Amino acid sequence: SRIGRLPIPVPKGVSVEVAPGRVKVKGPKGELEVPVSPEMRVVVEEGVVRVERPSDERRHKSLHGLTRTLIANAVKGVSEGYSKELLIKGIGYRARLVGRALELTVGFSHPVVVEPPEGITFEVPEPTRVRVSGIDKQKVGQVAANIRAIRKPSAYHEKGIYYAGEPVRLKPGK
Amino acid sequence: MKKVVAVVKLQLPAGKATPAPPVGPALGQHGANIMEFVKAFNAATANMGDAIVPVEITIYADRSFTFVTKTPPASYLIRKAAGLEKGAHKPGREKVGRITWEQVLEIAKQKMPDLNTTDLEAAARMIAGSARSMGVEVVGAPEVKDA
Amino acid sequence: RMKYRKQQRGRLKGATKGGDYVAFGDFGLVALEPAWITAQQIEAARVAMVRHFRRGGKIFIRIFPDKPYTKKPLEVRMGKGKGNVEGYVAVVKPGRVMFEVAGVTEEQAMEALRIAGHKLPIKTKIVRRDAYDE
Amino acid sequence: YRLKAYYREGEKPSALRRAGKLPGVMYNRHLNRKVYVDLVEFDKVFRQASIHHVIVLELPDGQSLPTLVRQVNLDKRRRRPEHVDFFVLSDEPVEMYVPLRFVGTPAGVRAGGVLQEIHRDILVKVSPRNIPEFIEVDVSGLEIGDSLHASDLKLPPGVELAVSPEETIAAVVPPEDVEKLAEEAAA
RNA sequence: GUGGUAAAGGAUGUGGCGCCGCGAAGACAGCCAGGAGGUUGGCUUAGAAGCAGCCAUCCUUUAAAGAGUGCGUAAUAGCUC
Ligand SMILES: [Mg+2]
Ligand SMILES: [Mg+2]
Ligand SMILES: [Mg+2]
Ligand SMILES: [Mg+2]
Ligand SMILES: [Mg+2]
Ligand SMILES: [Mg+2]
Ligand SMILES: [Mg+2]
């Protein structure tokens, strides 16, 4: 029932360093700083990181779980790495890579162009798919969301940018 | 070693019927062949007397249908000894008739092989039981007994 | 009714006699604030209850309007107002048993008296039977 | 049932109610004494006890007492106990209500109807030995119009009644509905 | 920014008190399998087949499934508790 007291596994070999209010997670794919509330206790044990809350009041539980999850996602991020996939469903719709930048034909009067931020890699397999990869979890999620926002899925047609495996619910018409 | 696509439930007398609704829209737009299909359906109803037999249909992938004749509705058995063609509009204050459990027993023997209910001692109360929501009670003799 | 003519106002003191105990029926509705319940509100709550469950049990009304509400035709100061524009009202002090119910289950009576509570100018309170008789 | 009880004196009744200690008075034709019990225990007891089922009070003296609740004053504004009178029994016959259990559903309720159980108990004079936990009532022939008086009754062995025989024990009443409002909207 | 000044009524706000139910014979949560038989309940109704309304109190294959919680459809199957 408690995510925060569940110890974070540490793969070999990613160095984890504790800091006043912060924690550095270094790994084969890069590095990530994680903001920790000064109230918490970050413990670097053998092959595992743990988190200890100061007390059992509401705020400290809600910070305990969040802390554990954030640090854990950092650990998975620096080693295994995060990457989401996006589907393009449409007639004239297509995607193509130019440089690092991504180009979309979302039916607008002009082809859309999106640039990769620091620590982000665009990938174009099939012309109607886009794999966004990176070390930062929330950054990848945000980037994929931003690319999706260019042309959200239609409410009446299979017409738009979908998440991988996103259930296509559609309304009738006439 | 057999195909299916859409199970469907249609009621019609054991020997007399027409492509009229609701049997119509059930096998009208689904496409049916009343040339050889009924020529095997009429066979299973040839010796069997009249009823409202709910032949549990299960439309195959090849547009066929499973004409396995299941036992007539629960409503059909109680209004047998009464001569009714229906029942009480409000089974609580009203009661169109009150057959004994003696008529319930032997008519339940035509509602058991298609049933997965084992013995008749359990099958009779299935007939007299649905009757209490139909508008008809019962009166028996043995029952609980004990010692 | 019969009596004779209009009647004074008079301040409602502490919930002295405005407090009883369930006599008839299972659950019950009770008051928590002093008020003049109009003859309209009573029938509104009753019809709300009979509207909720239809062919339900039986509803009681242990309060009754008999106090003449007065009112003037929006003018000045000639005599007392003839009134009865609201007709009659019932003086209810906190804890007075108001509406009883019977023959219905817990959820029916609960939801019904709950609906009746909003049709009233008082903060209400639903009560079981407990055990405290007489 | 049994329950702990203490002796009372000039202590503030209000302060005692503050302490949750419900005040009380144990008495009979011989005894008369100020006492007090705990409220939380009195609740769990009385929910199952009431004036019907007899209760035995305990004392620091070690004395058990065959008491019976005659009345319990209630404070207005959210129902709550104020004070409790205890009748310590003896052996001679003495009046007190006894519960009722209307077994079997009537004809009226089945065809749409409501049971208006008038008396949830019956006052009968009886010896402290004879304590019928419930008196059965073979109500079943009753329709939405008939009624059960104290006349026809499962009168217990060697137990007479104090109340008048013509007193109506119970009755059945019609189920009101929305279709009634149709006539009510007219007249 | 309550305090720095409004009510009926509403909410997984926060702390405190107590009663009730389930749990080391292994629960709630998320996660893997079934979710059904005569039944398509009686009756109303153009259609009412677990699913507009009126009315209510069966059993069995079984470790398990309420003659039935909602959505979906003309009625179905479905999703699932
Ligand atoms: Mg163009
Ligand atoms: Mg009159
Ligand atoms: Mg005044
Ligand atoms: Mg003037
Ligand atoms: Mg209100
Ligand atoms: Mg009297
Ligand atoms: Mg409020």
From Swiss-Prot, chain A:
Gene3D superfamilies tied to this protein: Ribosomal protein L6, alpha-beta domain
Molecular function terms, GO-annotated: rRNA binding; structural constituent of ribosome
InterPro entries: Ribosomal_uL6-like (IPR000702), Ribosomal_uL6-like_a/b-dom_sf (IPR036789), Ribosomal_uL6_a/b-dom (IPR020040), Ribosomal_uL6_bac-type (IPR019906)
Keywords in alphabetical order: Ribonucleoprotein, Ribosomal protein, RNA-binding, rRNA-binding
GO biological processes: cytoplasmic translation
PANTHER family membership: 60S/50S RIBOSOMAL PROTEIN L6/L9 (PTHR11655), LARGE RIBOSOMAL SUBUNIT PROTEIN UL6M (PTHR11655:SF14)
UniProt subunit comment: Part of the 50S ribosomal subunit.
Function per UniProt: This protein binds to the 23S rRNA, and is important in its secondary structure. It is located near the subunit interface in the base of the L7/L12 stalk, and near the tRNA binding site of the peptidyltransferase center.
Protein name, entry field: Large ribosomal subunit protein uL6
UniProtKB/Swiss-Prot annotation, chain B:
One Pfam family linked to the record: Ribosomal_L11_N
GO biological process: translation
Any one Gene Ontology molecular-function term assigned to this protein's record: large ribosomal subunit rRNA binding
CDD domains: Ribosomal_L11
Modifications the protein undergoes after translation, according to the UniProt entry: One or more lysine residues are methylated.
SUPFAM superfamilies: Ribosomal L11/L12e N-terminal domain (SSF54747), Ribosomal protein L11, C-terminal domain (SSF46906)
Coiled coil: none
Keyword rRNA-binding carried by entry: yes
Record GO cellular component, one term: cytosolic large ribosomal subunit
InterPro entries in alphabetical order: Ribosomal_uL11 (IPR000911), Ribosomal_uL11_bac-typ (IPR006519), Ribosomal_uL11_C (IPR020783), Ribosomal_uL11_C_sf (IPR036769), Ribosomal_uL11_CS (IPR020785), Ribosomal_uL11_N (IPR020784), Ribosomal_uL11_N_sf (IPR036796)
Family affiliation: Belongs to the universal ribosomal protein uL11 family.
PANTHER family xref list: 60S RIBOSOMAL PROTEIN L12, LARGE RIBOSOMAL SUBUNIT PROTEIN UL11M
Assembly notes: Part of the ribosomal stalk of the 50S ribosomal subunit. Interacts with L10 and the large rRNA to form the base of the stalk. L10 forms an elongated spine to which L12 dimers bind in a sequential fashion forming a multimeric L10(L12)X complex.
Stated name of the protein: Large ribosomal subunit protein uL11
Protein's organism: Thermus thermophilus (strain ATCC BAA-163 / DSM 7039 / HB27)
UniProtKB/Swiss-Prot annotation, chain C:
A GO term, aspect molecular function: structural constituent of ribosome
Matching InterPro entries: Ribosomal_uL16, Ribosomal_uL16_bact-type, Ribosomal_uL16_dom, Ribosomal_uL16_sf
A Pfam family reported for this protein in Swiss-Prot or TrEMBL: Ribosomal_L16
Entry keyword Membrane: no
Similarity remark: Belongs to the universal ribosomal protein uL16 family.
Complexes and interactors: Part of the 50S ribosomal subunit.
HAMAP family noted in UniProt: Ribosomal_uL16
General function of this protein: Binds 23S rRNA and is also seen to make contacts with the A and possibly P site tRNAs.
Name of the protein in its database record: Large ribosomal subunit protein uL16
Organism: Thermus thermophilus (strain ATCC BAA-163 / DSM 7039 / HB27)
From Swiss-Prot, chain D:
Keyword tags: Ribonucleoprotein, Ribosomal protein, RNA-binding, rRNA-binding
GO cellular component: cytosolic large ribosomal subunit
Similarity comment: Belongs to the bacterial ribosomal protein bL25 family. CTC subfamily.
Source organism, top-level taxon: Bacteria
Subunit note: Part of the 50S ribosomal subunit; part of the 5S rRNA/L5/L18/L25 subcomplex. Contacts the 5S rRNA. Binds to the 5S rRNA independently of L5 and L18.
Record gene name: rplY
Name of the protein in its database record: Large ribosomal subunit protein bL25
One Pfam assignment: Ribosomal_TL5_C
HAMAP family: Ribosomal_bL25_CTC (MF_01334)
Function comment: This is one of the proteins that binds to the 5S RNA in the ribosome where it forms part of the central protuberance.
NCBIfam families per record: bL25_bact_ctc (TIGR00731)
An annotated Gene Ontology molecular function: structural constituent of ribosome
Acetylation keyword on record: no
Biological processes per GO annotation: translation
